[PDB]
Amino acid sequence: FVRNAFTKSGNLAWTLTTTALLLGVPLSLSILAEQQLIEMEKTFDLQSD
C-alpha cells in the first residue's frame, strides 16, 4: 500500500511538472522579450538626452 502511494505520488509529480513546463515556458519567453524591448527603449532615451 505504501508502494502504491509512492506510485501515485510519482505519477502526480510528472503531470504537475509537465503542465508547469508547457504553460510557463512560452509565457517566460514573452516576458523576456518585453523586458529586452523596455531596456532598449531606455538606452534610446539615454542617447536622446
Binding site: T15, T18, T19, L22, L23, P26, L27, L29, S30, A33, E34, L37
Partner: protein
C-alpha cells in the same frame, strides 16, 4: 412610453457576441491547429480595403491543402470569395442599408454535394437588437417551408443588465411536422466595465455560464462551465469546466488553458518582424496520454509603395510617425 429617454438605456450587443470576450478572446478554440501551416496575404488598398491571400497546410483534418481568397470592403459593402484545391467555391455578401440594418448572404458550392445557403437580416435599435436568419431554405410543392429558421431578441432592462430569448424552428424532411425550441439569455456588465457575466439556457438541455475579468491592462482571465442533460430511459448529465488567461504585449500574444477533463493547452504568437510572425500551439491530454503540436507562420505584404512604407513604419521618405 415617454420616459424611455429618461431611463437612458444603451444598446446591448448581438446574441452572437454574448460571450465573445471569453469564447473568442481568452480561450484558444478559434486559434488552435495541428500540423504545419503557412498563410501569405497581400494588401492593395486600405480605405476600400482590398486584399488577397494564399494558404498552405499539411497534417490537419480541418484545413484544406491549398486555398485562395480575395475580399473587398467599403463602408456599406463586403464581398469575399474563396476556392480550395478540390474546387469548392464559397461566397459572402453583406450590404448595410444603414449602420443599424445589414443583410447577409452566404453561399457554398461544391461538386457532388448539394448547395448550402444561408440568409440573415440584422437590426440594432436604440435599446434592443433583433436578428432573424434562415439556414438552407427550400419550399415544397404545396408551399411549405423546409430547413431551419432562427429568430432572436435582446433587450436592455437596466443600464447594466440585458435579458433575451431565441426561438428555433426546424422542419427537415417536409413530410413531418416541424420542431420548436426556446432559449433564454442573460448578460450583466459591471459599472466599471471590468467584469462581464453571461448565461444561456438552451433548447437542447444545455446550460452555459461564463465570467470575464480584465485583471491588468495586459492580462485578461475567464472561466466557462457547460452542463448538458440527456438520456441513455435514464437521466444523463455531462459537465465541463474550463479556465484560461491571455497575456498580450507589443510583440507577442499568449493564451493558456486548463480543463476539467485533464487537458492543458497553450498558444503563442511571436512577431519576429513587422511583416512576419511565428505561431506555436501545443496540447497535453493527461487522461489519454497524447499530444498535439502545430507550428506555422504569417506573412503580410503590400501592393504599392505607400502601403509598403507604411507597414514597414518608415512612412514618407524614411520619416516615421512624429
Amino acid at each position: 412610453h415617454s420616459h424611455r429617454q429618461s431611463l437612458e438605456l444603451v444598446n446591448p450587443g448581438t446574441v452572437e457576441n454574448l460571450n465573445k470576450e471569453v469564447s473568442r478572446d481568452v480561450f484558444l478554440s478559434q486559434y488552435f491547429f495541428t500540423g504545419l501551416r503557412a498563410d501569405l496575404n497581400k494588401a492593395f488598398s486600405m480605405n476600400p480595403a482590398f486584399q488577397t491571400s494564399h494558404t498552405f497546410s499539411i497534417g490537419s483534418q480541418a484545413l484544406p491543402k491549398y486555398a485562395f481568397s480575395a475580399l473587398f470592403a467599403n463602408d456599406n459593402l463586403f464581398a469575399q470569395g474563396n476556392i480550395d484545391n478540390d474546387l469548392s467555391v464559397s461566397g459572402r455578401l453583406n450590404y448595410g442599408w444603414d449602420k443599424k440594418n445589414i443583410s447577409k448572404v452566404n453561399l457554398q458550392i461544391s461538386d457532388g454535394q448539394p448547395t448550402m445557403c444561408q440568409l440573415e437580416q440584422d437590426y440594432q435599435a436604440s435599446d434592443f437588437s433583433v436578428n432573424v436568419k434562415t439556414l438552407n431554405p427550400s419550399f415544397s410543392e404545396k408551399g411549405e417551408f423546409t430547413g431551419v429558421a432562427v429568430a432572436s431578441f435582446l433587450q436592455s432592462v437596466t443600464p447594466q443588465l440585458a435579458l433575451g430569448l431565441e426561438t428555433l424552428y426546424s422542419r427537415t424532411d417536409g413530410s413531418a411536422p416541424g420542431d420548436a425550441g426556446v432559449s433564454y439569455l442573460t448578460r450583466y456588465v459591471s459599472k466599471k466595465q471590468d467584469w462581464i457575466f453571461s448565461g444561456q439556457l438552451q433548447a437542447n438541455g444545455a446550460l452555459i455560464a461564463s465570467l470575464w475579468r480584465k485583471v491588468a491592462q495586459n492580462v485578461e482571465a475567464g472561466i466557462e462551465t457547460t452542463l448538458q442533460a440527456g438520456m441513455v430511459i435514464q437521466p444523463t448529465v455531462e459537465g465541463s469546466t474550463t479556465i484560461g488567461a491571455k497575456y498580450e504585449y507589443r510583440q507577442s500574444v499568449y493564451r493558456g488553458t486548463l480543463d476539467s477533463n485533464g487537458k492543458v493547452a497553450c498558444f503563442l504568437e511571436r512577431k519576429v518582424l513587422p511583416t512576419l510572425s511565428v505561431l506555436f500551439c501545443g496540447e497535453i491530454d493527461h487522461f489519454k496520454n497524447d499530444t498535439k503540436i502545430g507550428c506555422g507562420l504569417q506573412f503580410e505584404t503590400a501592393g504599392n509603395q505607400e502601403l509598403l512604407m507604411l507597414q514597414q513604419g518608415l512612412d514618407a521618405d524614411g520619416n516615421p510617425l512624429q
